[PDB]
């Protein structure tokens, strides 16, 4: 039950989401493209998204599709995550190692800032299998 974890599902005619790694009281977020993968080697795109309000992982926005179709963005998975390395530092320094333990999503993953050999400030969500 360390740093809080939550990932939000952006439903609609087409489904997307954003992977939110809350860090020492600030809920960092990371937008798709991101889906299932083998890894580590095929780091999923994790765009370093705005800082979302704490606890508010319940509801993001959009329009409940239960009406007649639209797509609602709410909680899909919620829990906590383990730092495999420096959680605070790595997130600043560009090298994150973590393990999720929540509602639906879990395991071990690495975030890496694409300032090097990549885009600029997006991150790489690859599996944290260094062992």
Curated annotation (Swiss-Prot):
Residues 1-130 are annotated as: 3'-phosphoesterase domain (PE). It comes from Pseudomonas aeruginosa (strain ATCC 15692 / DSM 22644 / CIP 104116 / JCM 14847 / LMG 12228 / 1C / PRS 101 / PAO1). LigD has variable architecture; domain order can be permutated, domains can be independently encoded, while some bacteria lack the 3'-phosphoesterase domain entirely. In the N-terminal section; belongs to the LigD 3'-phosphoesterase family. In the central section; belongs to the ATP-dependent DNA ligase family. Monomer. Interacts with Ku. The record marks 52 as: Transition state stabilizer. Changing residue 8 to A: 41% ribonuclease activity, 7% 3'-phosphatase activity (in PE domain). This is Multifunctional non-homologous end joining protein LigD. Mn(2+) 1 binds at residues 10, 16, 18. The N-terminal 3'-phosphoesterase domain (PE) has 3'-ribonuclease and 3'-phosphatase activities. Transmembrane segments: none annotated. With Ku probably forms a non-homologous end joining (NHEJ) repair enzyme, which repairs dsDNA breaks (DSB) with reduced fidelity. Acts as a DNA ligase on singly nicked dsDNA, fills dsDNA gaps (3- or 4- nucleotide gaps, prefers a 5'-phosphate at the gap distal end, prefers dNTPs over rNTPs), has DNA-directed DNA polymerase activity (templated primer extension) and DNA-directed RNA polymerase activity, adds 1 or 2 non-templated rNTP (or less well dNTP) to ssDNA or blunt-end dsDNA (primer extension).
């Amino acid at each position: 039950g360390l740093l809080r974890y939550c990932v939000q599902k952006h439903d609609a005619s087409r489904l997307h989401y954003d992977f939110r790694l809350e860090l020492d009281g600030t809920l960092k977020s990371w937008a798709v493209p991101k889906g299932p993968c083998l890894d580590p080697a095929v780091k999923r795109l994790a765009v370093q998204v705005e800082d979302h309000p704490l606890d508010y992982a319940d509801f993001e926005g959009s329009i409940p599709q239960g009406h007649y179709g639209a797509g609602d963005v709410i909680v899909w998975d919620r829990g906590a995550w383990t730092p495999l390395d420096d959680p605070r530092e790595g997130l600043e320094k560009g090298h994150l190692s973590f393990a999720l333990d929540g509602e639906k999503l879990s395991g071990r993953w690495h975030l890496i800032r694409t300032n090097l050999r990549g885009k600029q400030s997006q991150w790489f969500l690859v599996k944290a299998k260094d062992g």
